[PDB]
Design a protein around this ligand. Structure first.
Ligand code: NA
Length: 433
């Protein structure tokens, strides 16, 4: 038609002129009649083709067929089988037809009694169990539920796999582009005269020169299609952005008590912006550093060497595994499950920060999450929540609490918006004069 999702349960994407197309969003259209590459991602979430895939418009009743028996299976809101209806029987084979004829016309048995008497119900439980499982798989193959993307970039293909929060689990090249012009002869010669493998031929013709860039494009395109489903944006909102916002809020109460309602106010601007983070991407390392340096270069913001390396001590005593399991309590998103590795690095780079005053390594580490394919929202979510967990365990400086309060607002706000650095300098730092 093309089909929305392929046989293999993958969603197709093609990038032409930097623009993304997918059968999920065609458009037959008008005619037309229909583009094989698919339709563009809709700009408006209440366009027909957008709304079509909203959670509330996905089928709850799935028709499946098992050994000739036809079932309609009802699924709940999470696509789990909570109901079944037997909608049709298997065809005779006997001689059952001649027998059924006698049962019907002579003995006046209703049709369903004919089936009982013929053993059609012997394996009824087993069939229903299969039917439900098959319906549950159909639900997982529905576009907003798809996590496997086949992406065509300049005619190379990449399988991109994502988790339920849009993080990239893998990207793998599955096809290369056809040979063009004099590449055909070159290739035929490399194969038959030189005995090169196809992989070595692709290398020699330059096919790998832009492999990193094309893979980034495919990661992005797959994410953008994944992000285009409201079902998916909403899960990220509940499980990631809302949670991170709540954590930033708690800190605002903790630190606000030792630092005034100017910080309470600021903490609430940050939390609000985290909550409304939407389709934004975290600011660059270079930009984030410049905003952080604006705070760190304030003369009114110096903490004692004793204060700093005691704050480092607290980090040193923190068990990374323990902290990660506590993050695990927030939502499914906080158990990749990496996730200890991200905590352990936040631990060791904060130590570096407190000991040396160099916060670069800490900010670089968050950049590297996103370069790895971790979604901006999740990076921000894990960074916030890890820093938060430290801030709430303190215990027991207790004006060094104000120091971490400034620092957290500084590193977190640096990822969101330069106005937070300004806010820190303008209204909470209080220097001379
Ligand atoms: Na292709």
């Amino acid at each position: 038609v093309p089909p929305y999702v392929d046989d293999n349960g993958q969603v197709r994407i093609t990038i032409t002129n930097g623009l993304v197309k997918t059968p999920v969003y065609g458009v037959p259209g008008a005619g037309g009649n229909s583009d094989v590459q698919g339709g563009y991602i809709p700009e408006n979430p209440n366009d027909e083709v957008a709304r079509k895939w909203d959670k509330n418009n996905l089928p709850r009743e799935i028709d499946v067929s098992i050994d000739g028996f036809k079932y309609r299976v009802t699924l709940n809101d999470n696509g789990r089988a909570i109901g079944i209806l037997r909608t049709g029987v298997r065809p005779y084979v006997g001689s059952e037809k001649a027998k059924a004829g006698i049962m019907e016309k002579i003995n006046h048995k209703t049709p369903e009694e004919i089936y009982e008497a013929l053993g059609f119900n012997k394996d009824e439980s087993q069939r229903q169990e299969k039917a439900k499982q098959q319906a549950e798989d159909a639900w997982d193959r529905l576009p907003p539920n798809v996590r496997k993307f086949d992406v065509d970039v300049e005619q190379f293909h990449y399988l991109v796999v994502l988790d339920d929060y849009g993080n990239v689990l893998s990207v793998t090249r599955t096809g290369v582009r056809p040979y063009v012009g004099s590449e055909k002869a070159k290739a035929g010669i490399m194969d038959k005269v030189d005995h090169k493998t196809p992989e070595e031929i692709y290398e020699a013709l330059g096919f790998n020169n832009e492999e990193p860039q094309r893979q980034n494009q495919a990661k992005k395109a797959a994410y953008d299609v994944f992000y285009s489903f409201s079902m998916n944006r909403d899960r990220i909102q509940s499980d990631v952005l809302n949670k991170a916002a709540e954590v930033i809020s708690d800190i605002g109460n903790k630190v606000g008590d030792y630092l005034g309602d100017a910080y309470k106010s600021l903490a609430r601007e940050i939390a609000d912006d985290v909550k409304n983070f939407q389709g934004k991407t975290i600011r660059s390392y270079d930009d984030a550093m410049a905003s952080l340096n604006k705070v760190l270069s304030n003369p009114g913001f110096k903490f004692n060497r004793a204060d700093s390396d005691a704050l480092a001590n607290v980090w040193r005593s923190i068990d990374a595994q323990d902290m990660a399991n506590k993050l695990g309590n927030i939502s499914k998103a906080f158990k990749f499950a990496d996730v200890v590795m991200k905590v352990e690095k936040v631990r060791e780079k904060s130590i570096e920060g407190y000991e040396t005053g160099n916060w670069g390594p800490l900010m670089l580490e968050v950049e590297s999450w996103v370069l790895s394919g971790i979604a901006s929202a999740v990076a921000l979510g894990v960074f916030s929540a890890t820093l938060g967990a430290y801030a709430l365990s303190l215990g027991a400086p207790a004006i060094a609490v104000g120091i971490v309060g400034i620092l957290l607002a500084a590193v977190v706000g640096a990822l969101l918006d330069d106005k937070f650095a300004d806010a820190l300098n303008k209204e909470i730092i209080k220097p001379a004069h």
